[PDB]
Amino acid sequence: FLQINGYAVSRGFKDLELDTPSIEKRFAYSFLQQLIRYVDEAHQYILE
Amino acid sequence: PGQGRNNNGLEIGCVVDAASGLLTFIANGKELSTYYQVEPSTKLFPAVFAQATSPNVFQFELGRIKNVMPLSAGLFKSEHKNPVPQCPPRLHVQFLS
Amino acid sequence: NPQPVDTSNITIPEKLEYFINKYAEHSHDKWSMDKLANGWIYGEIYSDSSKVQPLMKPYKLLSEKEKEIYRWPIKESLKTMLAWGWRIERTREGDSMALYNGYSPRAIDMSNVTLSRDLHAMAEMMAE
Amino acid sequence: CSGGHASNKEKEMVTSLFCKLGVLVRHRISLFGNDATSIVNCLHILGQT
Amino acid sequence: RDDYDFLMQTSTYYYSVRIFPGQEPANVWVGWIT
Numbered sequence: 001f002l003q004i005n006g007y008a009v010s011r012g013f014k015d016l017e018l019d020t021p022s023i024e025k026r027f028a029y030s031f032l033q034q035l036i037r038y039v040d041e042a043h044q045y046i047l048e
Numbered sequence: 049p050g051q052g053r054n055n056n057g058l059e060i061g062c063v064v065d066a067a068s069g070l071l072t073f074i075a076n077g078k079e080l081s082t083y084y085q086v087e088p089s090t091k092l093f094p095a096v097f098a099q100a101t102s103p104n105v106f107q108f109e110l111g112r113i114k115n116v117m118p119l120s121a122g123l124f125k126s127e128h129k130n131p132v133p134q135c136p137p138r139l140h141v142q143f144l145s
Numbered sequence: 146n147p148q149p150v151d152t153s154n155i156t157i158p159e160k161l162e163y164f165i166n167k168y169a170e171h172s173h174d175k176w177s178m179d180k181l182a183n184g185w186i187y188g189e190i191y192s193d194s195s196k197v198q199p200l201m202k203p204y205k206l207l208s209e210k211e212k213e214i215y216r217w218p219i220k221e222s223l224k225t226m227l228a229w230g231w232r233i234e235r236t237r238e239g240d241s242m243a244l245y246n247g248y249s250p251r252a253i254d255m256s257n258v259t260l261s262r263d264l265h266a267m268a269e270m271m272a273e
Numbered sequence: 274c275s276g277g278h279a280s281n282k283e284k285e286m287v288t289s290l291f292c293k294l295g296v297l298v299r300h301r302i303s304l305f306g307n308d309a310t311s312i313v314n315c316l317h318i319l320g321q322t
Numbered sequence: 323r324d325d326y327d328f329l330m331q332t333s334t335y336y337y338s339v340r341i342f343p344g345q346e347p348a349n350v351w352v353g354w355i356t
Binding site for chain 4: 026035036040
Binding site: 052054056057058059060061062063064065066067071073084090091092093094095096097098099100101102104105106107108109110111112113114115116117118119121122129131 | 323324325326328329330332333334335336337338339340341342343344345346347349350351352353354355356
């Protein structure tokens with residue numbers, strides 16, 4: 001009834017910011033950062 | 049008037065004058081401003097272009113109005129003098145493919 | 146455990162009163178439809194077996210209290226869809242028709258109207 | 274051609290994974306609980322990547 | 323009440339199209355093609 005009356009339902013807003021250029025926005029970059037973190041931690045546990 | 053009315057579906061009626069070539073359209077009982085004048089001996093195919101927004105899109109109605117002859121009386125030379133609307137099996141819907 | 150969306154702080158715009166209009170009317174229309182199908186007749190006295198009901202007077206002839214409760218679920222529906230934040234915009238033809246401007250029950254059939262895929266998703270969010 | 278390219282940053286930091294895993298594997302196989310073969314396979318797949 | 327003589331002497335023909343409810347009318351065109 002809203003549509004036939006002509007009212008236009010839509011989303012509350014559209015995307016505020018597109019982080020597409022960000023390499024950090026990748027799954028792979030964050031996951032390999034996390035490996036940097038656990039591998040460096042493993043290096044220092046191995047030192048201990 | 050606009051919008052959707054279910055007392056009757058949106059009914060655009062096409063009127064063709066084979067003797068003058070005047071193409072006039074009637075929408076919901078009132079004549080539209082758009083009119084076309086065609087050349088003599090022009091063969092005109094009834095046509096409807098539509099994009100489907102519902103399972104039921106449109107319907108060809110082969111009826112007649114006051115003082116206007118049915119489509120079969122012009123399509124078929126055998127029924128040239130028959131005011132009763134007809135849909136012989138030869139008539140069928142075609143689509144561009 | 147259900148915690149539905151709060152709408153107490155939400156408020157309606159004055160533009161959607163025109164939407165409440167004709168839709169409370171359509172609701173009264175379909176109610177009259179199915180009840181007259183059951184046999185309900187416009188008798189001011191109220192009797193179930195006799196099927197005499199004083200409420201098939203048109204939406205205009207109804208009294209405001211009976212106009213209430215009819216609009217109530219629609220009010221909560223609009224307040225909810227606003228609590229979802231969903232922006233509602235009204236086209237030019239909507240304004241043009243508004244400027245254009247015994248009971249006869251006529252029902253508006255909207256079954257053949259089809260919504261889009263995302264629109265179906267929002268309808269599902271409504272239903273849930 | 275459809276896609277799926279790692280960024281150059283992805284690639285040098287993968288090589289950095291290679292460097293640290295080499296540092297760990299240098300002279301620590303005895304300390305590792307017999308998984309030295311697993312480190313060998315890991316640096317192998319890194320070596321191809 | 324249509325005039326039989328006019329119907330028999332006329333060359334004007336008619337067909338009509340019912341756009342069903344729920345079908346968006348601006349997406350529907352009706353007329354003639356060659």
